[PDB]
Design a protein around this ligand. Structure first.
Ligand SMILES: NCCOCCNC(=O)[C@@H]1CCNC(=O)CCC(=O)N2CCC[C@](Cc3ccccc3)(C2)C(=O)N[C@@H](Cc2ccc(-c3ccc(CCC(=O)O)cc3)cc2)C(=O)NCc2ccccc2CC(=O)N1
Length: 163
């Protein structure tokens, strides 16, 4: 399974690195989309974009590199793409899952859970998990709010593939 990284800052101050294992063994098409958006190999992707909605005791959401507000993004497949499967569950903190606007509306937006979000099982495609840097995720979460607006600008300053 590929390993990718997000290096995250808050108001320009580095918070550290999040390492994500992508479950290409279960959701290869969803894992590949995220991998390529981390490397930037198609000329666009996550680098320089933000965590735009962060809600404590819920999740940290990112990947809207077109509109920066939860309405946009772009997949590597030319259009919104189907839910590959709902095999993996939102079991706890550190789960990496696709944001969407209903069935079969996957793009580039994603979230990292900070609790078990079991009510999303069967609705959002889980495709990976944090293996290093959960403390960075908790730092991101600490800048969230009830509305999801962040108290500092949280940026993916760099991202890419490790292996
Ligand atoms: N329920 C029990 C108790 O739970 C309490 C905890 N709160 C919960 O469980 C809560 C409760 C319900 N609350 C909510 O849904 C919050 C919703 C919200 O913030 N927004 C703000 C932002 C825009 C809105 C409305 C919209 C959608 C679409 C376009 C324009 C406006 C609404 C929204 O929906 N945007 C989605 C992300 C999103 C992903 C992908 C795309 C997209 C895909 C493909 C392409 C082209 C690809 C190509 O061409 O290549 C382009 C775009 C667009 C939008 C959003 O944010 N979805 C919500 C969400 C995200 C992540 C995880 C979970 C959730 C559910 C949640 O948060 N649910």
């Amino acid at each position: 399974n590929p390993l990718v990284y997000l290096d995250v800052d808050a108001n320009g101050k580095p918070l550290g690195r999040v390492v994500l294992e992508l479950k290409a063994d279960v959701v290869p098409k969803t894992a590949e989309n995220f991998r390529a958006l981390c490397t930037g190999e198609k000329g666009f992707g996550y680098k320089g974009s933000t965590f735009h909605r962060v809600i404590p005791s819920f999740m940290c959401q990112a990947g809207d590199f077109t509109n920066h507000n939860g309405t946009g993004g772009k997949s590597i497949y030319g259009s919104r793409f189907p839910d590959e499967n709902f095999t993996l569950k939102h079991v706890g903190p550190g789960v990496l899952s696709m944001a969407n606007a209903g069935p079969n509306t996957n793009g580039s937006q994603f979230f990292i859970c900070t609790i078990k979000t079991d009510w999303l099982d069967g609705k959002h495609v889980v495709f990976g998990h944090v293996i290093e840097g959960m403390d960075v995720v908790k730092k991101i979460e600490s800048f969230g709010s009830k509305s999801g607006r962040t108290s500092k600008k949280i940026v993916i300053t760099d991202c890419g593939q490790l292996s």
